[PDB]
């Protein structure tokens, strides 16, 4: 890479890895549209396997950006509308509190306080229905944002219903394949296990549980990817109108539209955004925030900091990009280290290149 990119990356990431005791890390910088890759340390400490450009990391909630775009693609296909009631796609959801809760509310955590987690005990399709039927909202729909995997997870499941495809098949065929994300997985094939990094939690090697319909974890936090595929994902989100597939192009734009505002933050589908330039300090188990509706939603604003954090038991990920500047970064690590450290490092790198 240009020595300038080399030097800001190394000067920023080396101390981060030291301070946070990160076993392995991969970074991509997208600069004037082209990707530049950096790797450090270990995918597997015990087997002495290095992080490479081929190493798979668990994305955690960064998966929500894929879910948001897949949903956006389904809207563009005319299969679903965000304005539709949830009950249109799940008629068994007869309980009265569901009146007025739309797919938009599910996608954007504004349904009225859906819980962070689908309970562990939920296994069968009947168990899942019972959970959503019995849930009592604290708030009217579209009044407060409360981040919830049970909200965006259900959005993902319902968005693919009209297609007739499983969520995984829809994601593969409609998003991964067209964008040539050929090493991005929900279920990791046996052939790819050699490249699947271990996560590290309290010094112990860990992986996420295999996804299951009762957890809605494929839909909310189940994607694994390489630094190369994630750089390609950022490129695709930086320049959606260069994508050949018409509905995928509009799906990406829809996911970067601004639906709600909370302080300086705007909620998209999966993606979260702030106006650029951002105050770097402007970028808790439960945080309930009143939302202002953006009526109608602002189409993807090029002058934005668009980003998403993600974590699993053993992994910490971050993606951020600025469309106006053709600039972006992906940071993948096999330890879950604090979010502000990720954002600090990303901003230091992008600001220097901007």
Mutual orientation of helices 63-76 and 246-255 as an angle, nearest 10°? Answer: 120
Q: Cα separation of 268 and 180, whole Å?
A: 24
DSSP string, 253-314: HHHTSEEEEETTEEE-SS-EEEESSPPTTT------EE-EEEEEEEP--SSEEEEEEEEETT
In degrees and rounded to multiples of 5, residue 85 shows phi and psi of: -65, 145
Instruction: Show Cβ contacts of residue 27 under 8 Å, excluding neighbours closer than 6 positions.
Output: 9, 13, 37, 38, 39, 227, 329, 330, 331, 332
Instruction: Show Cβ contacts of residue 111 under 8 Å, excluding neighbours closer than 6 positions.
Output: 101, 105, 137, 141, 148, 151
Alpha helices in 60-137 (DSSP H): 63-76, 103-107, 125-134
Hey, is 321 helix, strand or coil?
strand
Distance of CA 79 to the CA centre of its chain: 22
Hey, is 185 helix, strand or coil?
strand
In this structure, what DSSP letter does residue 110 have?
Answer: -
Domains, the chain, in order of start with CATH, read 1-354 (3.40.710.10)
> Is residue 279 part of an annotated ligand binding site?
no
Count Cβ atoms within 10 A of the Cβ of residue 15 and give its class: 0-12 exposed, 13-18 middle, 19 or more buried.
exposed
> Is residue 117 part of an annotated ligand binding site?
yes
> Is residue 147 part of an annotated ligand binding site?
yes
Distance of CA 296 to the CA centre of its chain: 24
168 membership: H or E segment, kind and range: helix 167-171
> Is residue 149 part of an annotated ligand binding site?
yes
Instruction: Show Cβ contacts of residue 232 under 8 Å, excluding neighbours closer than 6 positions.
Output: 35, 179, 180, 181
Distance of CA 33 to the CA centre of its chain: 21
Hey, is 193 helix, strand or coil?
helix
Residue with tokens 């987690």: 117
> Is residue 351 part of an annotated ligand binding site?
no
Q: Cα separation of 52 and 41, whole Å?
A: 9
> Is residue 63 part of an annotated ligand binding site?
no
Q: Cα separation of 190 and 202, whole Å?
A: 27
Contact between 319 and 328 (Cβ < 8 Å): yes
Active site residues: 61
How many CB atoms lie under 10 A from the CB of residue 77?
16
Q: What is the resolution of this structure in A?
A: 1.6
Burial 308-317 (b: 16+ CB within 10 A, else e): bbbbbbbbbb
Planar angle of CA 317, 346, 342, nearest 5 degrees: 45
Nearest to 233 by CA among 280, 169, 171: 171
């Amino acid at each position: 890479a240009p020595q300038q990119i080399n030097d800001i990356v190394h000067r920023t990431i080396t101390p981060l890895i030291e301070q946070q005791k990160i076993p392995g890390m991969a970074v991509a910088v997208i600069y004037q549209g082209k990707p530049y890759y950096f790797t450090w340390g270990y995918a597997d400490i015990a087997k002495k396997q290095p992080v490479t450009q081929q190493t798979l990391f668990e994305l955690g909630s960064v998966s929500k950006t894929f879910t948001g775009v897949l949903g956006g693609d389904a809207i563009a296909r005319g299969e679903i509308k965000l304005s539709d009631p949830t009950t249109k796609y799940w008629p068994e959801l007869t309980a009265k509190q569901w009146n007025g809760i739309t797919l938009l509310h599910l996608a954007t955590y504004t349904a009225g306080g859906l819980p962070l987690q689908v309970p562990d005990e939920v296994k069968s399709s009947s168990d899942l229905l019972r959970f959503y039927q019995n849930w009592q909202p604290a708030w009217a729909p579209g009044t407060q944002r409360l981040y919830a995997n049970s909200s965006i997870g259900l959005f993902g499941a319902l968005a693919v219903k009209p297609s007739g495809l499983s969520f995984e098949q829809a994601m593969q065929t409609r998003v991964f394949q067209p964008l040539k994300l050929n090493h991005t997985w929900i279920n990791v094939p046996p052939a790819e296990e050699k490249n699947y990094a271990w996560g590290y939690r309290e010094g112990k090697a860990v992986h996420a549980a295999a996804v299951s319909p009762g957890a809605l974890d494929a839909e909310a936090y189940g994607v694994k990817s390489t630094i190369e595929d994630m750089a390609r994902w950022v490129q695709s989100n930086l320049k959606p109108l260069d994508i050949n597939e018409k509905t995928l192009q509009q799906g990406i734009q829809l996911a970067q539209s601004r639906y709600w505002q909370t302080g300086d933050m705007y909620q998209g589908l999966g993606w979260e955004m702030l106006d650029w330039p951002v105050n770097p300090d402007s970028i808790i188990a439960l945080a309930a925030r009143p939302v202002k509706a953006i009526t109608p939603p602002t189409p993807a604003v090029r002058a934005s900091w668009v980003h998403k954090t993600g974590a699993t038991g053993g992994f910490g990920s971050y993606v951020a990009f600025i469309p106006e500047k053709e600039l972006g970064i992906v940071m993948l690590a096999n330890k879950n280290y604090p979010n502000p450290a990720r954002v600090d490092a990303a901003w230091q790198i992008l600001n220097a290149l901007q």
